[PDB]
Every structure is written in structure tokens, then in C-alpha cells.
């Protein structure tokens, strides 16, 4: 059958019994850095069993009148085990990810999500003169949520979270040009994306640059008759792939 997968990374295994196919990047697989493109002169650290495993983020609830969520994920994994320790003692670092969003419901529920993973997402602020601060842009393994209203401008520093403009000023329908999948509760049960390292430099600092953004937007909202289970959660498990670091220093 074409509905069962099994992904094994490190000492963790994610299985699924009904699913769509897996979408992989822009056609490439995450691999290490070659000697033609390297610019640093110290030998990198590849632990590759301790940091290449599945880390499970916190769960969010899919209500009926929900709008959306987003994570960043060079930053959502900053407190998760030995991946968050190598980010502190090192100055550089590159990695690729594999993302597995999972959300299950019965045959009597209905709904549809859009699981997209965009690179270099600059967000717009509510106040037209300032740029948004750090704690309004990203939370460590905690989802920041879209709204379906318009955020006022006289707040200090807040992201404009109108969901039909997706926070970046583009149409939310045209977000399907990025690598994406749909979780349709009629057929699908989980989405899987394998993302390579997309950046204009071969290595970058991991504490002041978030080169990805995982957005989950419900296009057709959740609905059910009276009697079914009203609590439907969403859980996201991310796993780094082929990670390496340079520039060992103090803790910061």
C-alpha cells in the first residue's frame, strides 16, 4: 500500500497508517557541506546521533473559530536537548530539517489545514514606523497565533496578524508556491516535509537568523455534529538532518 510510512532517525521512530506522499524540498535532499563551498578553516563537529532525532514541540488545540499558528525553528529547538546546547557554544552552524505535523479525527469530522514551510519570512508590524520585537515574533516551542481581525497600530511593537494577508503582505492563497502539503481530515492524517539548507551564505549564526517558518492555516474550518469529541489537538515533531557547527567559544 501507499499509505504507510516509517521514518527512523537516531533513536526515534515515527510511524503512520494513513498519509499522503512525502514532499522533499525543492527536489534536493539534505547533505553535508563540500570542500568547494566551505569558507571556514576549522574542522566542524558532526555529532549526528545526538542532534539528528525527532523533537516533539508543544500541542495546540484546533477550535472551530481558529485562525492559524506559526513557529520559526532554528529557534523553536533552542531548548531541546543537545541541539540547543551546540547552538550556544558554537558561533556558526548549518542544518536541514524534516517536519511531521500530525492531527487525527474520526470519520464524522471535517476540516482542512495548509502545512507550508516558508524560507526568510519577514513579518510586518502593526505600528507603521517600528519593527516587531523578539518576543512577539517567536516563542521557544510555543506557537504564536494568527487572528481574523486587524491588529491596532497604537500598540508598542506587535506583529500584524491578519490571516488573509499571512503577516507578510502577500495573498494567503498564493502560499502554495512554497513546499507544502494539506491535511484533509476526510482522507489525510499527517503531513511530512523534508527541507534542505536554504541560505545565501554557506553557514550562518543560529541565534540572530531564522531562515525558516512553519505556518499552519485552516482554510476549511473544523465542524462536527453534537455528540462527537470537541477536543482536536495538533502536534508538530521536527528533526534536524545533517547538522554541523564551527567556531567553539564560551556559553553565551
Amino acid at each position, epitope marked *: 500500500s501507499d499509505r504507510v510510512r516509517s521514518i527512523t532517525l537516531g533513536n526515534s521512530t515515527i510511524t503512520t497508517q494513513e498519509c499522503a506522499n512525502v514532499v522533499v524540498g525543492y527536489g534536493v535532499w539534505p547533505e553535508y557541506l563540500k570542500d568547494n563551498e566551505a569558507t571556514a578553516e576549522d574542522q566542524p563537529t558532526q555529532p549526528d546521533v545526538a542532534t539528528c532525532r525527532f523533537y516533539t514541540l508543544e500541542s495546540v488545540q484546533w477550535m472551530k473559530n481558529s485562525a492559524g499558528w506559526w513557529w520559526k525553528l532554528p529557534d523553536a529547538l533552542s531548548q531541546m536537548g543537545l541541539f540547543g546546547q551546540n547552538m550556544q557554544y558554537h558561533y556558526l552552524g548549518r542544518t536541514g530539517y524534516t517536519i511531521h505535523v500530525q492531527c487525527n479525527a474520526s470519520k464524522f469530522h471535517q476540516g482542512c489545514l495548509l502545512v507550508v514551510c516558508v524560507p526568510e519570512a519577514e513579518m510586518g508590524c502593526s505600528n507603521l514606523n517600528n519593527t516587531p520585537e523578539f518576543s512577539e515574533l517567536s516563542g521557544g516551542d510555543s506557537a504564536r497565533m494568527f*487572528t481574523d481581525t486587524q491588529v491596532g497600530e497604537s500598540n*508598542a511593537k506587535k506583529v500584524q496578524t491578519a490571516v488573509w494577508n499571512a503577516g507578510m503582505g502577500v495573498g494567503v492563497g498564493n502560499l502554495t508556491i512554497f513546499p507544502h502539503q494539506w491535511i484533509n481530515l476526510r482522507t489525510n492524517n499527517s503531513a511530512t516535509l523534508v527541507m534542505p539548507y536554504i541560505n545565501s551564505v554557506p553557514m550562518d549564526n543560529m541565534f540572530r537568523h531564522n531562515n525558516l517558518t512553519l505556518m499552519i492555516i485552516p482554510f476549511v474550518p473544523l465542524n462536527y455534529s453534537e455528540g462527537s469529541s470537541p477536543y482536536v489537538p495538533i502536534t508538530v515533531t521536527i528533526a534536524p538532518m545533517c547538522a554541523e557547527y564551527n567556531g567553539l567559544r564560551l556559553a553565551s
Partner: antibody, heavy 119, light 107 residues
Framework: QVQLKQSGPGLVQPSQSLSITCTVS????????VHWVRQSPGKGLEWLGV???????DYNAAFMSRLSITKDNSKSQVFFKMNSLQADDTAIYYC?????????????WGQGTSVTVSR | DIQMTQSPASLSVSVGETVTITCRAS??????LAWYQQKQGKSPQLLVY???NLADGVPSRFSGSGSGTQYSLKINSLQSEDFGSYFC?????????FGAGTKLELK
């Protein structure tokens, strides 16, 4: 899950300072902001000030020169201070957290301490 | 700033009928409105946020609607535990202002 609660002085002399400490439980100050709302019997409900999740504050216009709200992220406590305490400040003061699914509404409120400004 | 004029100031109705409480802003707030309910001598509880959405534990008797400047709240079947006060409080812009207040005697 149990939520925030406060503790105040109760009775304050005129032209003095007032300080209620609202301590929280079950969440962090790195994700939510705590408002301060004054329930008055004569002027009704009114909004005094807020401290956001980033640390910046935003006060009311009429209470600008007297209010000062700070917090500590580690001990999970917020502090507020009003000065010069005139006669109409006999009311009950609430602390309440914001960001109800990103919508900046108050979900849970403190028990409220009733203050009196008189001798 | 912006004022919220709430009407009517009081009501006297019985158990099981449909009422409607409205409040009007000064200018457009883009559906940034929250409704509260306060009983005698406790803290106010959030009832309807963002002018349409329901809260966590609030049953489906309450319903809020409106857009632009005119908003409303409607209970189709009023019950015995639902008296008290009701306020509307916009969060579009600091300074946030509350409503005047409505009272339900349930006579």
C-alpha cells in the same frame, strides 16, 4: 489549573503610595501580558495600564505621571505603583492576564483587593 | 480617544425570552470588541471575544454580532443563572475603554 492572585495593603493614607503585588501560577511572563483594571462605584470600570510580554509598558493618559508597572520574569511576579493618591481612588483593583489566543482579551482576573483612601 | 455608549442601561425581563444588548463605538474598531459578565461581588468573566467568537466554557445561548461601529449581543433563551451586568470593552487602541453597564433584574 490555578491562576494568578494578588495581595495588597488594604488601607492607605492620602497623598501616599500604593503597591499591590500580583503573583501568577500555571504560565510564564514570557508569553502573556498583565493588565490593571480599576472597578469604581462612581466612575464605573476603567483601564489603568498594562505591561506587555516584551517588557515595554503602556499607561493611561490621565494616570501617566503617577503609574509605574514593572515585573520579574524569574519569580513570576508583577509590581505596580501609583502615587499622590487623591480622594476618588477608593475602589477595588484587579490584575488580569491578556492575549486570549492572540486577541488581547482578559480571560482570568484576580480576586481584587478593595482599597480605601480615607482616614 | 473613543467612547463606548451602551444601551439600554437596564432591563426587566423574565426567564425564557430573547433580549438584545447593543453598544456603539465612536469610530471604527474592526470587530475588536470583548463582552464581559459580572455577578454580585466577584471578578468579571469573559463572555464573547472578537465580537463573534465564544469563550471556552461559555454555553451556546450567547451570541454576538456586528461590524464596523455597531455591535450587539443576543441571548435566545435566558436562564436562571444568567443575570448580572454586561459590559463591552474594545481592544483596538490604547486607551481601552469599557462600557457603561446593563442590569438584568430577572423579574
Amino acid at each position: 489549573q490555578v491562576q494568578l492572585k494578588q495581595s495588597g495593603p488594604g488601607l492607605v493614607q492620602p497623598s501616599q503610595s500604593l503597591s499591590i503585588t500580583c503573583t501568577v501560577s500555571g504560565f510564564s511572563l514570557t508569553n502573556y501580558g498583565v493588565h490593571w483594571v480599576r472597578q469604581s462605584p462612581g466612575k464605573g470600570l476603567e483601564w489603568l495600564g498594562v505591561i506587555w510580554r516584551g517588557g515595554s509598558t503602556d499607561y493611561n493618559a490621565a494616570f501617566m505621571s503617577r503609574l509605574s508597572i514593572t515585573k520579574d520574569n524569574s519569580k513570576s511576579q508583577v509590581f505596580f505603583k501609583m502615587n499622590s493618591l487623591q480622594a476618588d481612588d477608593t475602589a477595588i483593583y484587579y490584575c488580569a492576564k491578556g492575549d486570549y489566543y492572540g486577541y488581547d482579551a482578559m480571560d482570568s482576573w484576580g480576586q481584587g483587593t478593595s482599597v480605601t483612601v480615607s482616614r | 480617544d473613543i467612547q463606548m455608549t451602551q444601551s439600554p442601561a437596564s432591563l426587566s425581563v423574565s426567564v425564557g425570552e430573547t433580549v438584545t444588548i447593543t453598544c456603539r463605538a465612536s469610530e471604527n474598531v474592526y470587530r475588536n470588541l470583548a463582552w464581559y459578565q459580572q455577578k454580585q461581588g466577584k471578578s468579571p468573566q469573559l463572555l464573547v471575544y472578537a465580537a463573534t467568537n465564544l469563550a471556552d466554557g461559555v454555553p451556546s445561548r450567547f451570541s454576538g454580532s456586528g461590524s464596523g461601529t455597531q455591535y450587539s449581543l443576543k441571548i435566545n433563551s435566558l436562564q436562571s443563572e444568567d443575570f448580572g451586568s454586561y459590559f463591552c470593552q474594545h481592544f483596538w487602541s490604547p486607551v481601552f475603554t469599557f462600557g457603561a453597564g446593563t442590569k438584568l433584574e430577572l423579574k
